[PDB]
Design a protein around this ligand. Structure first.
Ligand SMILES: Nc1ncnc2c1ncn2[C@@H]1O[C@H](COP(=O)(O)OP(=O)(O)O)[C@@H](O)[C@H]1O
Ligand SMILES: Nc1ncnc2c1ncn2[C@@H]1O[C@H](COP(=O)(O)OP(=O)(O)O)[C@@H](O)[C@H]1O
Ligand SMILES: [Mg+2]
Ligand SMILES: [Mg+2]
Lengths: 247, 48, 241, 290, 100, 97, 96, 244
């Protein structure tokens, strides 16, 4: 009986709607994040269950702000709204209070806060997804965080989520080092993900992006050296191929 | 109870995929046109 | 039964929802406040762990609400997030209005009222958070409270909420003294924690700490969340490591 | 910096397209200059930290001592591997000293000459440097003794190591030891303790998520043991995986060990008398090619 | 209810001081530990039952079965504790990841 | 393809070594005429026909029922090629529940 | 199989000989297969039961069935009792 | 199974997927029509069947293909009620984007705002999800021919060609074989007309039935424009097929 409100607790505690939401997450695609000391690499694989469907149309790697991207595992529809609501809160709360994009630590709290509301009301369901959010800021360095449909956030050095989580997680535990390059971290990433699938593994269907060091290329304006380009950069298929060939 | 706990792989290394494909050869002689090794690559989650 | 709303009562005048919400707090990690007459120490145990969990750069159950009162967290973290933010705003709102910082007794009362409201009114969950409050205000000196998720509060000289509540409380009152010392108090939290926890390592990665003292400087009040490398250092001295 | 680094390079060229006497003469000049540098002449020979000059000198030491091949020049250099660790005593000299010692064994060398040097250097590590330097080289040494057909000496060193790593529980260094323990025991015809420490290898590693090379060596060792138990389906399957790991890795001494494995594959199917599978394996795909 | 049956006997999780004796008697039937380290292993892992204490010895003397030796040793006893821990791990692992 | 091929020659299935394949579950809304198709398949082979009902002669007991079952099997083996059509196989099924 | 083949070996050590054997893995791993093999080479009695066959046909019929099966094992002892499915039978808890 | 929560889209299953949201994917075969859209090299063609079972209906009001805004089409599969509401929303959205942001709304931005709107309908309990698959077609100002299929869950994904309906799978395989053998992702025909002819050919093949000029409705996107063709313009294309 305690399952089906959000209002009913079990005798043992906890709410079911949060528990069942976590079940949902784990059905979604295999996505993983590794924190490095000069980057963060965030990676997922993609499908469409029909080759007719194009694969750029989907985006499962989205820059949230120019310095902070995110992925998911879980239900597709829920991601797309929640990223819209997050960009929109990012401006309200912090791009009018700093006049630029918020630090990573801040924005984790704000997105986690929309989850908290989608549990608080009854007759409104949680969101179906768990995010990884990785970004970089000027005071806490490079960073990685997990934001659960619970409305709780957890800081992570490395984690994985989704269908291949349990296997990916033990591979990460062993293979991670405390000091890795951005470049080495990409190789641990492609490889980890290749556990989840083989023979249909190619750079076309694998989306893999980074938050590294500034790029002056995607800044789009030049002559003002007192602002930094996007820390986020999305890598293309052909570039992922260079790294997959090099393995 | 309950002394011996036996684990099975189910993702399977190439080493274990090969053995169950190798059951075909034991069972009956097969064509030089056949290549078993082709099948070990394409697998990713395939039990016996 | 009389689970089905939170605005009902039962044939015995219990409410299953208040009991169930209470048991939620014994699902989440130990949290201990021990008051001594030379400081209050807050110590808490984590409820999550693994070699790739980061927990060596971060606190997540020690929050300074304002600048002279802080809380330890026990219960759900989601439930916790909203009420910590509300509590910090009201503590600090007082600051603005009256241009002196909030007293301990008023801020706990306020937040208990908010708690109670979710049971009393609407079709909402009660909030399953037990906050240990440690403050200083110059009216009663050092003050220790904890608030129930039922939404009421009682003062304390030592208390333990969070997992293994019963065991911890027994442990604390065997070796406690009224004279005490702040340094003996730190050692006491560390003593209790070894036993209560189900992890036999009990190393820095599992441990949070903050001590609030007015013996820190003189005429001044200092809230110090310790950093991870101090938490390690004190584990040798009590000999657990 | 410029002159020792350019000189190092100038020496190498005179071996391969010029007379060997002029090469030997530039190596001798270099010893003298580098030694002054190692033992400091400004606090790092260049003032303040090591900078480029001092770190250029330690790196070029592995091409001074052993380009080289079996010559008498190569013998002469080997005792003097031990001395530099005292002369430096940096945190990265530890790393270079492991690279240097291993290098003399890889090119042609008499085994006897090399032992002495390794026992002397283990003493310099465990006297006052670092334990970390001590462990590696005792592993290397027991292997060297195993190849010289002394198996008593190899075990004695394994036992020290085994007990210090029942105190420590993360160390992957204890997979290499365990692995090695089994090879010693194969030759004693203790095929019990070959198993005992083959199992211990899997437990102290985390699957085969350990470096791909060590997995080659570990798969190879299962391979021998089951072949002796008269299971030739299990022996063939391990040996193929290990071949694959050697073959796809870029050989440096792994060309040697891939040949050992290629033989055994065939060996197995000879025993059953499946002539089919002997010639499935032999084409020219890598059997008569690389 | 509670007249029936109103005496109660609790049989607790064993202490290390209790566990040493449980190892001792199971080894007296078997072949003793060499260097007599049977008390020493008790401290390294405490069981959570009396039958977990039993579970070490059976696993330990199993190793002696593989090799077909007539003794048991400390090293056999140590490997054996680790089998018993696998079980506590299999039951609860998700309470450290994706909890609250 | 299922029935007719291995019956004429078990001989090809034996070369490959993969088992000659048997067991076909016929399904579809009633009145499909799949019992009529049972006849048409075996009409080509000229195979003998055993239509068994299993109600009115069969209950919950396995006493009586085993006598009935043993006979059908024996008649087809003698009268081979024969196809045994097991009808009402769903009256003698059951589930875990 | 080994307790059957060399009982003396257990006695010598004075080791309490093994008992239950959980076999486990995800499905299609080959568990049923392995235990089919055990039954030929044991050269001894064999009892295989299912969890679809351990049901209640009546109220309190379920437990009657267990007691018959483990008495029967003793009658024909030594014998190996195999239950294919104990995944429906064993469940940690209920709200029922 | 059942118990709660095929009665609610705000209450999860022990599966983790909402059973009533899955029923909207079983409510899409209700009117028993099939759609095909393919991409040309400056046009998009979309064709869905027309059922006029009785002579009482006028085949000119029986359609599922709609003009959404100047450059934007849509074909709907599933029931008429959710079809109108979706179509309206889309008409309103297209119109709004322009006063806010200036120029003609791309196929992609329309599809994405309707997908986000579908997801909201499932978020709240006081609104149910829609019961239609929407297949939008446009030729884009800067990306050219584009097909975006937005499903009633709030999932949206693009296409090279797509098909929808109860006989979908047959058209889908038909299309896989075709685009795979050519080794391209487009049809290489350079007029809108010979792309409409090819589409006719392929729906006839896949379903396996000859259709008539009273059983097709065809909407054609060219760049900057959208039109729905009448029955007598549709015949020109048919007689082109019928003797080549
Ligand atoms: N393909 C067909 N050709 C001719 N008659 C048919 C055909 N299919 C069905 N029928 C008719 O339907 C009757 C009933 O089918 P029957 O084989 O008794 O069916 P089921 O087991 O599906 O109920 C047949 O006897 C025959 O008259
Ligand atoms: N080691 C193996 N050799 C050959 N076939 C195998 C092997 N393992 C499993 N299989 C095949 O898988 C089939 C199904 O496995 P089964 O034992 O019924 O599985 P589970 O109980 O794990 O679901 C077996 O009938 C067999 O054909
Ligand atoms: Mg019939
Ligand atoms: Mg099974």
């Amino acid at each position: 009986r305690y399952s089906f409100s959000l209002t009913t607790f079990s005798p043992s505690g906890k709410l079911g709607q949060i528990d069942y939401a976590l079940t949902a997450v784990k059905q979604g695609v295999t996505s993983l994040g590794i924190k490095a000391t000069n980057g963060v690499v965030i990676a997922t694989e993609k499908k469409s269950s029909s080759p007719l469907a194009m694969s750029e149309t989907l985006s499962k790697v989205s820059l949230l702000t120019p310095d902070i991207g995110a992925v998911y595992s879980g239900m597709g529809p829920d991601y797309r709204v929640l990223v819209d609501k997050s960009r929109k809160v990012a401006h309200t709360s912090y791009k009018r209070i700093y006049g630029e994009y918020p630090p990573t630590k801040l924005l984790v709290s704000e997105v986690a806060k929309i989850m908290q509301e989608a549990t608080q009301s009854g007759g409104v369901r949680p969101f179906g997804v768990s995010l990884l959010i990785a970004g970089h800021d000027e005071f806490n360095g490079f960073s990685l965080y997990q934001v659960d449909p619970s409305g709780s956030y957890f800081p992570w050095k490395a984690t994985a989520i989704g269908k291949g989580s349990v296997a990916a997680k033990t591979f990460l535990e062993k293979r991670w080092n405390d000091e890795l390059e951005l470049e080495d971290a990409i190789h641990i990433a492609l490889l980890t993900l290749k556990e989840s699938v083989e023979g249909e593994f190619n750079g076309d269907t694998i989306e893999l992006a980074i938050i590294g060091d500034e790029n002056p290329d995607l800044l789009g304006y030049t002559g003002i050296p007192t602002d930094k380009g996007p820390r986020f950069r999305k890598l293309t298929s052909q570039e992922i191929n260079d790294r997959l060939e090099a393995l | 109870r309950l002394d011996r706990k036996i684990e099975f792989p189910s993702l399977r290394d190439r080493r274990e995929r090969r053995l169950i494909f190798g059951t075909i050869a034991s069972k009956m002689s097969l064509a030089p046109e056949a290549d078993l090794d082709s099948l070990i690559i394409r697998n990713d989650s395939l039990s016996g | 039964r009389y689970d089905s709303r939170t605005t009902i009562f039962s044939p015995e005048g219990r409410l299953y929802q208040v009991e169930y919400a209470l048991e939620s707090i014994s699902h989440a990690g130990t949290a201990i406040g021990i008051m001594a007459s030379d400081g209050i120490v807050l110590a808490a145990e984590r409820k999550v762990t693994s070699t790739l969990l980061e927990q060596d750069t971060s606190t997540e159950k020690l929050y300074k609400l304002n600048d002279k009162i802080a809380v330890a967290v026990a219960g759900l973290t989601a439930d916790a997030e909203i009420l910590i933010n509300t509590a910090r705003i009201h503590a600090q709102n007082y600051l603005k209005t009256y241009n002196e910082d909030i007293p301990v007794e008023i801020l706990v009362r306020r937040l208990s009222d908010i708690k109670q409201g979710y049971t009393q009114h609407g079709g909402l969950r009660p909030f399953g958070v037990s906050f240990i409050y440690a403050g200083y205000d110059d009216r009663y000196g050092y003050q220790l409270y904890t608030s129930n998720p039922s939404g009421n509060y009682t003062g304390w000289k030592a208390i333990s909420v969070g997992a293994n509540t019963s065991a911890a409380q027994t442990l604390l009152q065997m070796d406690y003294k009224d004279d005490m010392k702040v340094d003996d108090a730190i050692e006491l939290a560390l003593k209790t924690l070894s036993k209560t926890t189900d992890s036999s390592a009990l190393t820095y990665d599992r441990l949070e700490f903050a001590t609030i003292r007015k013996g820190a400087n003189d005429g001044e009040v200092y809230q110090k969340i310790f950093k991870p490398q101090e938490i390690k250092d004190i584990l040798v001295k009590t000999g657990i490591t | 910096m410029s002159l020792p680094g350019s000189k190092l390079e100038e020496a190498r060229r005179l071996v391969n397209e010029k007379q060997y006497n002029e090469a030997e003469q530039v190596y001798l000049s270099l010893l003298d200059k580098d030694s002054s540098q190692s033992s400091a002449a400004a606090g790092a020979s260049v003032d303040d930290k090591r900078r480029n000059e001092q770190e250029t000198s330690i790196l070029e030491l592995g091409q001074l001592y052993v380009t080289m091949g079996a010559k008498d020049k190569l013998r002469e250099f080997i005792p003097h591997s031990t001395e530099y660790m005292m002369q430096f005593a940096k945190s990265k000299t530890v790393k270079v000293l492991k690279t240097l010692i291993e290098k003399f064994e890889q090119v042609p060398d008499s085994l006897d000459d090399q032992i002495f040097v390794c026992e002397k250097s283990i003493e310099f590590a465990k006297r006052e440097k670092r334990v970390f330097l001590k462990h590696s080289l005792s592993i290397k040494l027991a292997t060297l003794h195993y190849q010289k057909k002394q198996y008593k000496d190899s075990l004695a060193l394994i036992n020290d190591l085994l007990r210090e790593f029942k105190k420590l529980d993360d160390k992957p260094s204890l997979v290499d030891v365990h692995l090695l323990e089994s090879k010693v025991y194969h030759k004693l015809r203790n095929l019990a303790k070959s198993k005992a420490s083959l199992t211990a290898a899997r437990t102290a590693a985390n699957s085969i998520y350990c470096p791909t090379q060590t997995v080659a060596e570990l798969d190879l060792m299962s391979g021998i043991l089951h072949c002796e138990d008269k299971d030739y389906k299990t022996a063939f399957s391990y040996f193929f995986e290990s071949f694959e790991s050697y073959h796809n890795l870029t050989t440096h001494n792994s060309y040697e060990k891939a040949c050992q494995v290629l033989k055994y594959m065939l060996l197995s199917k000879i025993m059953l008398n499946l002539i089919d599978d002997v010639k499935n394996i032999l084409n020219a795909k890598y059997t008569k090619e690389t | 209810r509670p007249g029936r049956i109103d005496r109660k006997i609790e049989f607790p999780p064993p202490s290390v001081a209790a566990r040493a004796e449980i190892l001792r008697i199971h080894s007296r039937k078997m072949n003793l530990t060499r260097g007599i380290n049977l008390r020493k292993v008790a401290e390294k892992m405490n069981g959570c039952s009396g039958a977990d204490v039993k579970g070490v010895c059976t696993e330990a003397g199993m190793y002696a079965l593989r090799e077909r030796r007539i003794h048991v040793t400390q090293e056999d006893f140590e490997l054996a504790v680790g089998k018993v821990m696998n079980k506590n791990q299999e039951t609860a692992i998700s309470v450290a990841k994706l909890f609250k | 393809e299922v029935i007719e091929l291995p019956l004429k020659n078990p001989e090809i299935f034996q070369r490959v070594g993969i088992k000659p394949p048997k067991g076909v579950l016929l399904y579809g809304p009633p009145g499909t005429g799949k019992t009529l198709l049972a006849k048409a398949v075996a009409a080509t082979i000229g195979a003998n026909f055993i239509f068994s009902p299993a109600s009115g002669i069969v209950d919950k007991y396995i006493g009586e029922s085993a006598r009935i079952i043993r006979e059908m099997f024996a008649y087809a083996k003698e009268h081979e090629p024969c196809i045994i059509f097991m009808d009402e196989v769903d009256a003698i099924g059951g589930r875990r529940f | 199989e080994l307790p059957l083949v060399q009982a003396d070996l257990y006695e010598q050590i004075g080791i309490d000989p093994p008992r239950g054997v959980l076999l486990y893995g995800p499905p299609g791993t080959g568990k049923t297969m392995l235990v089919k093999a055990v039954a030929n080479s044991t050269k001894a009695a064999f009892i295989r039961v299912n969890g679809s066959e351990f049901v209640h046909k009546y109220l309190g019929e379920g437990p009657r069935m267990v007691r018959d099966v483990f008495r029967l094992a003793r009658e024909n002892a030594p014998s190996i009792i195999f239950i294919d499915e104990v995944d429906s039978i064993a469940t940690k808890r209920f709200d029922a | 199974s059942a118990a709660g929560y095929d009665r609610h889209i705000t209450i999860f299953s022990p599966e983790g997927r909402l059973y009533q949201v899955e029923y909207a994917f079983k409510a899409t075969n209700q009117t028993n029509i099939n759609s095909l859209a393919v991409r040309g090299k400056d046009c998009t063609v979309v064709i869905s069947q027309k059922k006029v079972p009785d002579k009482l209906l006028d085949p000119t009001t029986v359609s599922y293909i709609f003009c959404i805004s100047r450059t934007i089409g849509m074909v709907v599969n599933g029931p008429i009620p959710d079809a109108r509401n979706a179509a309206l929303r889309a008409k309103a959205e297209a119109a709004e984007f322009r006063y806010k942001y200036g120029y003609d709304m791309p196929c992609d931005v329309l599809a994405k705002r309707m997908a986000n709107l579908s997801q909201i309908y499932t978020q709240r309990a006081y609104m149910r999800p829609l019961g239609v698959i929407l297949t939008f077609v446009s030729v884009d100002e800067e990306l050219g021919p584009s097909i975006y299929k937005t499903d009633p869950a709030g999932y949206y994904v693009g296409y090279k060609a797509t098909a929808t309906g109860p006989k979908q799978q047959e058209i889908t395989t038909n299309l896989e074989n075709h685009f795979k053998k050519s080794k391209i992702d487009h049809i290489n025909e350079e007029s809108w007309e010979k792309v409409v002819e090819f589409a006719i050919t392929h729906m006839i093949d896949a379903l396996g039935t000859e259709f008539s000029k009273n059983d097709l409705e065809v909407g054609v996107a060219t760049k900057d424009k959208f039109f729905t063709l009448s029955a007598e313009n549709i015949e020109e294309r048919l007689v082109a097929i019928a003797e080549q």
